[PDB]
C-alpha cells in the first residue's frame, strides 16, 4: 500500500499507532484479526513539522477474504487537535483463489454421451413398436390365397 502522511503545525510529534480489529458480530465464529494481515516496519516513528513520511504496508493473505482491519488509531503524545485526538485509516485486503475450471468442461461431454445412450434407449422403444408391425400384415393374405 505505502500510505503517506503529511504534517503541518510547526510541532514535532511521535507517530505511534494501534490496531483495532473489525468488531465482528457476537455470533461470528471467525478470528481474522489475531494474526496481523497488514504489517508495517515504520511503526512508532517520529514526525517533524512540515514533513511527509511514507509507510509501506504489506498485505499477507491466508484465504480469499476482505480482511477488514481498520487500523484507524494513530496516537501522538501531543494528541492531535485536528478533529479528534486519534486519526483513522481504513485498511482492506482482498485475496482471490483463481479457481481452475479448465477440466470442468471435461465432465460435460459425458452428458452428451448419455444423450447418445438415451437415443439408444428410445430406439429400443422403436424396436418394440415395430415388433407389432410384422404380425399385422400376413393375416388377410392366406384367406384370399386359398
Amino acid at each position: 500500500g505505502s500510505v503517506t502522511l503529511v504534517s503541518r503545525g510547526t510541532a514535532a510529534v511521535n507517530w505511534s499507532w494501534r490496531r483495532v480489529p473489525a468488531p465482528q458480530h457476537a455470533h461470528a465464529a471467525t478470528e481474522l484479526s489475531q494474526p496481523p494481515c497488514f504489517a508495517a516496519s515504520l511503526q512508532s516513528g517520529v514526525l517533524l513539522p512540515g514533513q511527509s513520511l511514507t509507510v509501506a504496508v504489506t498485505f499477507e493473505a491466508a484465504a480469499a477474504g476482505t480482511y477488514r482491519e481498520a487500523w484507524e488509531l494513530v496516537t501522538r503524545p501531543p494528541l492531535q487537535g485536528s478533529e479528534g485526538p486519534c486519526l483513522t485509516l481504513r485498511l482492506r485486503g482482498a485475496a482471490e483463489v483463481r479457481d481452475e475450471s479448465g477440466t470442468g468442461r471435461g465432465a460435460l461431454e459425458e452428458a452428451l454421451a448419455e444423450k447418445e445412450k438415451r437415443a439408444k434407449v428410445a430406439a429400443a422403444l422403436e424396436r418394440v413398436l415395430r415388433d407389432v408391425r410384422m404380425p399385422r400384415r400376413p393375416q388377410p393374405h392366406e384367406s384370399v390365397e386359398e
Binding site: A22, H25, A28, A63, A64, T66, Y67, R68, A95, D99
Partner: peptide
C-alpha cells in the same frame, strides 16, 4: 458491509 465481509471470509469463490 459487516456481515457481507464475514460471509465472504467464511466462504470465498
Amino acid at each position: 458491509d459487516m456481515a457481507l465481509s464475514e460471509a465472504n471470509v467464511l466462504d470465498p469463490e
